[PDB]
Amino acid sequence: MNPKRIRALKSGKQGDGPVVYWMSRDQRAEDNWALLFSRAIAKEANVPVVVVFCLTDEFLEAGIRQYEFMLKGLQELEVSLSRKKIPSFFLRGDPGEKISRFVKDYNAGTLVTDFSPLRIKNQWIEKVISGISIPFFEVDAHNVVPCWEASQKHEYAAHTFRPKLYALLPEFLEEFPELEPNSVTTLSDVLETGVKALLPERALLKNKDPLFEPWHFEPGEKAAKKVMESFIADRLDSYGALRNDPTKNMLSNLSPYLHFGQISSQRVVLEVEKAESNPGSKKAFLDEILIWKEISDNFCYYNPGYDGFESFPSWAKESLNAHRNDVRSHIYTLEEFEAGKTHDPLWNASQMELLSTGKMHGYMRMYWAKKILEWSESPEKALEIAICLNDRYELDGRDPNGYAGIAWSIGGVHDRAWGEREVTGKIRYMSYEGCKRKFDVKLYIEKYSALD
DNA sequence: ATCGGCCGCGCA
């Protein structure tokens, strides 16, 4: 393994016991540098490797759509791990509290977790640290260049981070060895229970049936390898030319799998790299999954206030400030956006794309989040409604890519200042009629007319 | 250091 992928969190005396992988972000058995590290420590010490996943009450902030998708990654994940003789364990509480009992109860010798830059991970890791005595390592298994190696500061834009990332790519772009089975030796209720809890929160139509359409993405590692091979085979060619057209389904549709870590961006990079197609389609796509996926981690990692106004750049702050008294063409309430009740049929279309499938089209997500800022009473409230719907309804929500994507839209983070306007100040504008030069907007509204 | 280099619109 490339050692630079490892951070030592807590130093102590290596217990005699097993290596416990605390599985958080990267819920996969293959192409996992974290579990590949745990097994190596279990191997040298001739102790086993084991997985422990912590199911927290944060699922009740989202909905059936995400929770189902995730606890079927997990059922399949466990069949896979047992097949390698690595048993997995599923605790049901506060990680800081619960993971600390596990290591102590089970005489864990060494504890490993994967890397995530979101605030709450830090709260737990710091609680685990103060309650264990065995060593404690962290591994970046979600990025190609470990987040703290690509850059040590917040990067102002993609084109300041782009040299830094490619500087280090030949070293960190590499094949994955093979997860070696152990030598040394309930998820059904958990879902049935979680679901009954979330059942009065489903989005229904006027009729009783749910809004969500569960057949657009199958969850799992197996599914995610076919979404990836499908993209490489059918859409990667057309990607640069049609990535921006909401009527063509020419995206990878990989974001829900990456979010849960059911597939590794590094594998995807490897396979796109090796694959022949339009060299511009490969360049266009590699920038999305290398430069934009990883500066988004860079973002939350250096900006603890990443989901708030205070992390916008200074120019963006001043400008939105001076336009807090400008009169707004419309003001909608959370619940009115929520049910696509604006005058803008394009907006409502895209909101209807969000509610029924769980994945709104890449381009339409920009447009969507800017009209929230233009038609709400203040930036804080627009940031609030946009996080809220993003995380409530996007399969790929509750994710750095989310906070970094909203802050681009509403705040100009990783963007630049544009022609000053009312309400939106110097923040990049996007117009209806600009969409109309770009794609048959009429076809996209026809698609989603379930506003009942 | 001193400057290059990161959507909407008019038009053919």
Added chain:
DNA sequence: TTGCGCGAAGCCGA
């Protein structure tokens, strides 16, 4: 549509 040149606009890093 479809590409091009332009506009308005602040800031990083050679």
